[PDB]
Amino acid sequence: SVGIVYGDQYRQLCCSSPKFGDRYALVMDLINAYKLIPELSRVPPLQWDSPSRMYEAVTAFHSTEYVDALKKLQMLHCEEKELTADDELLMDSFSLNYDCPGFPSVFDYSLAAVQGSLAAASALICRHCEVVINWGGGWHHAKRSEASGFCYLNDIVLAIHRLVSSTPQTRVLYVDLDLHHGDGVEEAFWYSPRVVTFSVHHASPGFFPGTGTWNIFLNGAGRGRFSAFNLPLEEGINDLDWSNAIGPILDSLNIVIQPSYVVVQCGADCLATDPHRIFRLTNFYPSLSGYLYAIKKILSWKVPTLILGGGGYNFPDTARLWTRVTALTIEEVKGKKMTISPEIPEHSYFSRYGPDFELDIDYFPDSIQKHHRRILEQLRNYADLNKLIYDYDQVYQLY
Ligand SMILES: CN(C)c1ccc(C(=O)NCCCCCCC(=O)NO)cc1
Ligand SMILES: CN(C)c1ccc(C(=O)NCCCCCCC(=O)NO)cc1
Numbered sequence: 336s337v338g339i340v341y342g343d344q345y346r347q348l349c350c351s352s353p354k355f356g357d358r359y360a361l362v363m364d365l366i367n368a369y370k371l372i373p374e375l376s377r378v379p380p381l382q383w384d385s386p387s388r389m390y391e392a393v394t395a396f397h398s399t400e401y402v403d404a405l406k407k408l409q410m411l412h413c414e415e416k417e418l419t420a421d422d423e424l425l426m427d428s429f430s431l432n433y434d435c436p437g438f439p440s441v442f443d444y445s446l447a448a449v450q451g452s453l454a455a456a457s458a459l460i461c462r463h464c465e466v467v468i469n470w471g472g473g474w475h476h477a478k479r480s481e482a483s484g485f486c487y488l489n490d491i492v493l494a495i496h497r498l499v500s501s502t503p504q505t506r507v508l509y510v511d512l513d514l515h516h517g518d519g520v521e522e523a524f525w526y527s528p529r530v531v532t533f534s535v536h537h538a539s540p541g542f543f544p545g546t547g548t549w550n551i552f553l554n555g556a557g558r559g560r561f562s563a564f565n566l567p568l569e570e571g572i573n574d575l576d577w578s579n580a581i582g583p584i585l586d587s588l589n590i591v592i593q594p595s596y597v598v599v600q601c602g603a604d605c606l607a608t609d610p611h612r613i614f615r616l617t618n619f620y621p622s623l624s625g626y627l628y629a630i631k632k633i634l635s636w637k638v639p640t641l642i643l644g645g646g647g648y649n650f651p652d653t654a655r656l657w658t659r660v661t662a663l664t665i666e667e668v669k670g671k672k673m674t675i676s677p678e679i680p681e682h683s684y685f686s687r688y689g690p691d692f693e694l695d696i697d698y699f700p701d702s703i704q705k706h707h708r709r710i711l712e713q714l715r716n717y718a719d720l721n722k723l724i725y726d727y728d729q730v731y732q733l734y
C-alpha cells in the first residue's frame with residue numbers, strides 16, 4: 336500500500352512553527368478534500384517508551400549537547416523572562432538564532448518530523464507499505480550540532496540511518512529535489528558508500544547554503560569517495576529542461592547502485608510561483624511537472640521509497656503540488672486511476688485557493704552536457720571503488 340504520515344497531535348505540532356504556519360494543514364486537507372485519504376494507509380508517528388529511548392534515537396545523528404540545547408530553548412520560550420547572556424551564547428554556539436529562532440514548541444515541532452520519518456522508515460522495513468509519504472518531514476539542512484535553514488533536527492538522516500541499519504548489503508539512494516542543496520544529508524553520509532546522495536538545486540554566489548557546486552567538485556571522502564552527487568542549475572529552468580537534466584542521472588544511479596530503498600526530498604520551492612522566484616517548475620499533469628516526471632520515474636523502479644516534503648513558501652501552491660504527487664503515487668504503486676478535478680473541491684481551506692480555485696498553479700510557461708559527462712565519470716569511479724558491475728554502454732546511452 337501507499338502510506339502517509341498524519342495524526343491529530345502530529346498536525347498540531349507540524350503547524351506550530353512561525354515559518355511554516357499552517358502549511359501542513361492545507362496540504363493534508365487538500366488531499367482529504369480530493370478523497371485520497373481512504374486510498375492511503377495512515378502511518379502513525381513514532382512515540383517512545385522513555386526520554387532515554389527518545390535521546391538514543393535522536394543522538395544516532397545529533398549530539399546530546401545539541402539536543403539538550405534545543406530542549407532548553409523550548410523551555411525558555413515557554414517562560415515570559417528573556418534569555419540570560421549565557422543562555423544567548425549557548426544558543427549561538429548551536430546556531431539557534433536569527434533564521435532558526437526559538438519558539439514555544441521548537442523542540443516538539445522538530446521532533447515531530449523525526450517521529451514521522453522514523454515511523455515511515457519502519458513501515459517500509461516491515462513491508463507494510465511499498466511507499467510512505469511524510470509531508471511534515473524533509474528537513475535537509477540540520478547538522479549534528481547545528482540548526483540551519485529553518486531545520487532543527489534532521490529527520491532525513493535519522494530515517495536513512497534506520498533504513499541502512501535494518502539488515503544484520505543495504506544501499507540507500509537519496510534524491511533531493513528542493514531548490515536548495517541538501518547539505519546536511521550529504522555531509523552526514525560523506526564517508527559512507529552505502530548511502531549515495533544526489534541533490535539537484537540552484538547554486539549561485541551568495542545563494543544559500545553555498546555548497547553543491549564547484550569549490551574543484553568534491554564528491555565524498557574516504558570509503559565514501561564519489562558517493563555524493565550534485566547538479567547545480569542556473570536560474571529560470573523550466574519543467575522540460577529540468578526533467579531532461581535529471582532524468583538520465585536518476586536512471587543511471589538506479590542501474591549502477593541497485594538501491595534497497597530510495598528516499599526523496601520533494602521541497603516545493605522550485606515552483607514558478609514560490610516567492611524565491613528562481614526555477615519555473617509547475618504541478619501540471621497533462622508540459623509535465625518536473626516533480627511529477629521525477630517521482631513517476633523513481634516509482635517505476637519498484638524499490639521501497641520514502642517521499643518527504645521540505646521547502647515551499649507558497650502554501651496553497653505547495654498543497655497543489657503535493658496533492659498531485661500523492662495522487663500520482665497511488666496511481667503508480669496500485670495501478671488504480673486517481674482522477675483529480677481541475678477545480679479545487681470545497682473544504683475548510685477553500686478560500687486560500689482564490690481567486691481562480693483551480694488545481695494547476697497560476698503560471699503560463701552546454702553547461703548541462705558538461706555536468707552529465709562529469710556525473711557519468713563519477714558514477715564509473717563510484718562503481719569501480721565499490722566493485723559494482725554494470726554495463727557502461729547501457730549507462731552512457733541514457734545520456
Ligand atoms: C546574521 N543574520 C541576521 C543572518 C545571517 C544569515 C542569514 C541567511 O543566510 N538566511 C538564509 C536562509 C535561507 C534558508 C533556505 C531554506 C530552504 O528552503 N531549504 O531548502 C540570515 C540572517
Ligand atoms: C516499491 N514500489 C515503489 C512499487 C511496488 C510495486 C509496484 C507495482 O507493481 N505497480 C503496478 C501498477 C503499475 C502502474 C503503471 C501503469 C500505467 O501507467 N498504465 O498506463 C509499483 C511500485
Ligand SMILES: [K+]
Nearest residue numbers: 511513535536
Ligand atoms: K535539492
Ligand SMILES: [K+]
Nearest residue numbers: 524527530562
Ligand atoms: K555518501
Ligand SMILES: [Zn+2]
Nearest residue numbers: 513515604646
Ligand atoms: Zn529549499
